[PDB]
Design an enzyme around this catalytic site. Structure first.
Site, PDB file in Angstrom:
ATOM      1  N   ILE A  35       0.729  -1.380  -0.125  1.00 54.95           N
ATOM      2  CA  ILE A  35       0.087   0.059   0.066  1.00 54.95           C
ATOM      3  C   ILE A  35       0.970   1.061  -0.057  1.00 54.95           C
ATOM      4  CG2 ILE A  35      -2.182  -1.172   0.777  1.00 54.95           C
ATOM      5  CD1 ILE A  35      -1.511   0.102   3.782  1.00 54.95           C
ATOM      6  N   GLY A  38       8.009   3.626   2.362  1.00 54.70           N
ATOM      7  CA  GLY A  38       8.702   4.674   3.315  1.00 54.70           C
ATOM      8  C   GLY A  38      10.181   4.718   2.796  1.00 54.70           C
ATOM      9  N   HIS A  39      10.927   5.357   3.682  1.00 58.12           N
ATOM     10  CA  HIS A  39      12.222   5.318   3.549  1.00 58.12           C
ATOM     11  C   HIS A  39      13.206   4.084   3.855  1.00 58.12           C
ATOM     12  CE1 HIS A  39      12.529   9.539   2.638  1.00 58.12           C
ATOM     13  NE2 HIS A  39      11.493  10.224   3.472  1.00 58.12           N
ATOM     14  N   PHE A  40      12.456   3.310   4.529  1.00 58.91           N
ATOM     15  CA  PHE A  40      13.208   1.920   4.888  1.00 58.91           C
ATOM     16  C   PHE A  40      12.690   0.704   4.295  1.00 58.91           C
ATOM     17  CE2 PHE A  40      15.934   4.445   7.635  1.00 58.91           C
ATOM     18  CZ  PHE A  40      15.125   5.463   8.223  1.00 58.91           C
ATOM     19  N   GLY A  41      11.565   0.645   3.681  1.00 59.75           N
ATOM     20  CA  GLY A  41      10.747  -0.229   3.004  1.00 59.75           C
ATOM     21  C   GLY A  41       9.314  -0.297   2.396  1.00 59.75           C
ATOM     22  N   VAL A  43       4.965  -0.858   2.815  1.00 53.44           N
ATOM     23  CA  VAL A  43       4.204  -0.534   3.381  1.00 53.44           C
ATOM     24  C   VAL A  43       3.082  -1.414   3.279  1.00 53.44           C
ATOM     25  CG1 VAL A  43       2.396   0.899   5.185  1.00 53.44           C
ATOM     26  CG2 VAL A  43       4.649   1.575   4.253  1.00 53.44           C
ATOM     27  N   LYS A  61       4.650  -0.767   8.225  1.00 49.55           N
ATOM     28  CA  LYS A  61       5.871  -0.810   7.725  1.00 49.55           C
ATOM     29  C   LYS A  61       6.917  -1.772   8.083  1.00 49.55           C
ATOM     30  CE  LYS A  61       6.229   4.103   6.795  1.00 49.55           C
ATOM     31  NZ  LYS A  61       6.914   5.327   7.512  1.00 49.55           N
ATOM     32  N   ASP A 155      11.251  16.292   6.071  1.00 49.02           N
ATOM     33  CA  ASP A 155      10.878  15.584   4.680  1.00 49.02           C
ATOM     34  C   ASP A 155       9.267  15.848   4.506  1.00 49.02           C
ATOM     35  OD1 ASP A 155      11.187  14.052   2.302  1.00 49.02           O
ATOM     36  OD2 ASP A 155      10.498  12.199   3.482  1.00 49.02           O
ATOM     37  N   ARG A 159       3.305  14.059  -0.517  1.00 43.78           N
ATOM     38  CA  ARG A 159       3.298  12.334  -0.616  1.00 43.78           C
ATOM     39  C   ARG A 159       3.510  11.785   0.705  1.00 43.78           C
ATOM     40  NH1 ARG A 159       8.295  14.296  -2.248  1.00 43.78           N
ATOM     41  NH2 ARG A 159       9.817  14.079  -0.972  1.00 43.78           N
ATOM     42  N   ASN A 160       3.892  12.650   1.675  1.00 41.48           N
ATOM     43  CA  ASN A 160       4.031  12.089   3.113  1.00 41.48           C
ATOM     44  C   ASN A 160       2.816  12.338   4.095  1.00 41.48           C
ATOM     45  OD1 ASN A 160       6.540  10.635   2.892  1.00 41.48           O
ATOM     46  ND2 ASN A 160       7.578  12.633   2.871  1.00 41.48           N
ATOM     47  N   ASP A 173       4.423  10.518   7.560  1.00 44.09           N
ATOM     48  CA  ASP A 173       5.680   9.660   7.378  1.00 44.09           C
ATOM     49  C   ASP A 173       6.581  10.672   8.154  1.00 44.09           C
ATOM     50  OD1 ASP A 173       7.348   7.302   5.856  1.00 44.09           O
ATOM     51  OD2 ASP A 173       8.546   9.171   6.106  1.00 44.09           O
TER      52      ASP A 173
HETATM   53  O1  Q6W Z   1       3.875   5.604   0.990  1.00 46.47           O
HETATM   54  C1  Q6W Z   1       4.137   6.740   1.544  1.00 46.47           C
HETATM   55  C2  Q6W Z   1       4.622   7.162   2.498  1.00 46.47           C
HETATM   56  C3  Q6W Z   1       5.059   6.096   3.663  1.00 46.47           C
HETATM   57  C4  Q6W Z   1       3.734   5.929   4.408  1.00 46.47           C
HETATM   58  C5  Q6W Z   1       3.586   6.473   5.703  1.00 46.47           C
HETATM   59  C6  Q6W Z   1       2.223   6.254   6.338  1.00 46.47           C
HETATM   60  C7  Q6W Z   1       1.475   5.378   5.918  1.00 46.47           C
HETATM   61  C8  Q6W Z   1       0.244   5.070   6.560  1.00 46.47           C
HETATM   62  C9  Q6W Z   1      -1.199   4.433   6.294  1.00 46.47           C
HETATM   63  C10 Q6W Z   1      -1.754   4.201   4.942  1.00 46.47           C
HETATM   64  N1  Q6W Z   1      -3.010   4.145   5.128  1.00 46.47           N
HETATM   65  C11 Q6W Z   1      -3.417   3.872   3.759  1.00 46.47           C
HETATM   66  C12 Q6W Z   1      -2.751   3.567   2.777  1.00 46.47           C
HETATM   67  C13 Q6W Z   1      -3.529   3.302   1.251  1.00 46.47           C
HETATM   68  C14 Q6W Z   1      -3.073   3.129   0.008  1.00 46.47           C
HETATM   69  N2  Q6W Z   1      -4.096   3.103  -0.906  1.00 46.47           N
HETATM   70  N3  Q6W Z   1      -5.230   3.269   0.011  1.00 46.47           N
HETATM   71  C15 Q6W Z   1      -6.575   3.364  -0.845  1.00 46.47           C
HETATM   72  C16 Q6W Z   1      -6.810   2.079  -1.558  1.00 46.47           C
HETATM   73  C17 Q6W Z   1      -8.001   2.090  -2.294  1.00 46.47           C
HETATM   74  N4  Q6W Z   1      -7.883   3.302  -3.360  1.00 46.47           N
HETATM   75  C18 Q6W Z   1      -7.778   4.622  -2.378  1.00 46.47           C
HETATM   76  C19 Q6W Z   1      -6.367   4.387  -1.937  1.00 46.47           C
HETATM   77  C20 Q6W Z   1      -4.861   3.649   1.170  1.00 46.47           C
HETATM   78  C21 Q6W Z   1      -1.380   3.735   2.650  1.00 46.47           C
HETATM   79  C22 Q6W Z   1      -0.947   3.947   3.793  1.00 46.47           C
HETATM   80  C23 Q6W Z   1       0.680   3.858   3.615  1.00 46.47           C
HETATM   81  O2  Q6W Z   1       1.205   3.262   2.709  1.00 46.47           O
HETATM   82  C24 Q6W Z   1       1.496   4.886   4.418  1.00 46.47           C
HETATM   83  C25 Q6W Z   1       2.831   5.143   3.682  1.00 46.47           C
HETATM   84  N5  Q6W Z   1       3.714   7.761   0.666  1.00 46.47           N
HETATM   85  C26 Q6W Z   1       3.429   7.710  -0.780  1.00 46.47           C
HETATM   86  C27 Q6W Z   1       4.302   7.589  -1.889  1.00 46.47           C
HETATM   87  C28 Q6W Z   1       5.499   6.832  -1.576  1.00 46.47           C
HETATM   88  C29 Q6W Z   1       6.445   6.963  -2.542  1.00 46.47           C
HETATM   89  C30 Q6W Z   1       6.102   7.822  -3.738  1.00 46.47           C
HETATM   90  C31 Q6W Z   1       5.042   8.367  -3.768  1.00 46.47           C
HETATM   91  N6  Q6W Z   1       3.981   8.396  -2.913  1.00 46.47           N
END
Ligand code: Q6W
Length: 299
Positions: A35, A38-41, A43, A61, A155, A159-160, A173
């Site tokens: 889903i 992060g900076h280390f792996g 999620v 994470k 940071d 996106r965070n 993040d």
């Molecule tokens: O990943 C990161 C930063 C690291 C980080 C930090 C905290 C979180 C916390 C919770 C979370 N909750 C829901 C969803 C999620 C994911 N999708 N959905 C729904 C699913 C159904 N469709 C609508 C969305 C919910 C995803 C996350 C995460 O992956 C997450 C990730 N930024 C994002 C990033 C990282 C790298 C490059 C670009 N962007």
């Protein structure tokens, strides 16, 4: 397959981890459902069984292919730094799961709508100008809180940040976040987001709440451009020169003139001249309340 030697970590860090521990039997990591990153792996989706026996949807994470103890220590700190966070615009920590073998797991609440950048980029979601200002105000309130606890984010970017089921924006993040103690700064000792960094931080590698204000300004620009990449025709290596020349991100097309003034203030070359997050909350709140346009969410 890793075995982490806890005796190789700082004792204060291990005790802190022990306090927020999640029993290995209480967590199911949906490792076939990625889903985020992060900076280390990566999620993953997760299912957390609580103290009352209810299933809680979470985000988990993990560390991607672990080689050294220093990486484990930084990863655990990205969870521990969040332990006392209690603010509607700041993501909380659910706990840390550390099994007999394998990567430790940092467990966070699941944010229904995902990351702020992807959310605003979705042509169907189409947030209005007022919706976007409201998201900016929410991030400002989360940063005002973080700054009050003397933490430097380092940071801050769209996106965070994540959006929950009630459209509450949370700074999510904390992979590069640092405690400033009583120093009012953090300098790098041991992959930096160059286009979001304050000019002085690019030059000295010293970060402060005022360098976070600069990043906040870029985040506001990302909001008002509906997630456009900053400085697309400027190379990462030429940013320092570009900024020293006094050049800045230009006003987004539908951006109110007073909000663009706020962005410009965030990029003042003299850090002391930038507004505080408390001042940003006041200014953006007044811009938000006086912009009479279509609006969906609750800010
Ligand atoms: O990943 C990161 C930063 C690291 C980080 C930090 C905290 C979180 C916390 C919770 C979370 N909750 C829901 C969803 C999620 C994911 N999708 N959905 C729904 C699913 C159904 N469709 C609508 C969305 C919910 C995803 C996350 C995460 O992956 C997450 C990730 N930024 C994002 C990033 C990282 C790298 C490059 C670009 N962007």
């Amino acid at each position: 397959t890793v075995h982490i030697d806890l005796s190789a970590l700082n004792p204060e860090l291990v005790q802190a981890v022990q306090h927020v521990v999640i029993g290995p039997s209480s967590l199911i990591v949906h490792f076939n459902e990625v889903i985020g990153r992060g900076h280390f792996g990566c999620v993953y989706h997760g299912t957390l069984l609580d103290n009352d026996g209810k299933k809680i949807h979470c985000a988990v994470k993990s560390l991607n292919r672990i080689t050294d103890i220093g990486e484990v220590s930084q990863f655990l700190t990205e969870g521990i730094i969040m332990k006392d966070f209690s603010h509607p615009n700041v993501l909380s920590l659910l706990g840390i799961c550390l099994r007999s073998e394998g990567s430790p797991l940092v467990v966070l609440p699941y944010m229904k709508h995902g990351d702020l950048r992807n959310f605003i980029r979705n042509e169907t979601h189409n947030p209005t100008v007022k919706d976007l200002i409201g998201f900016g105000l929410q991030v400002a309130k989360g940063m005002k809180y973080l700054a009050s606890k003397k933490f430097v984010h380092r940071d801050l970017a769209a996106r965070n940040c994540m959006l929950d089921e009630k459209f509450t924006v949370k700074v999510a993040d904390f992979g590069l976040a640092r405690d400033m103690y009583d120093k009012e700064y953090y300098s790098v000792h041991n992959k930096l987001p160059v286009k979001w960094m304050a000019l002085e931080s690019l030059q000295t590698q010293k970060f402060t709440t005022k360098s976070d204000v600069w990043s906040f300004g870029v985040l506001l620009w990302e909001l008002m451009t509906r997630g456009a990449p900053p400085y697309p025709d400027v190379n990462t290596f030429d940013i320092t020169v570009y900024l020293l020349q006094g050049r800045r991100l230009l006003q987004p097309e539908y951006c109110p003139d007073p909000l663009y003034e706020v962005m410009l203030k965030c990029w003042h070359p003299k850090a002391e001249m930038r507004p505080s997050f408390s001042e940003l909350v006041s200014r953006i709140s007044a811009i938000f309340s006086t912009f009479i346009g279509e609006h969906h969410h609750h800010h």
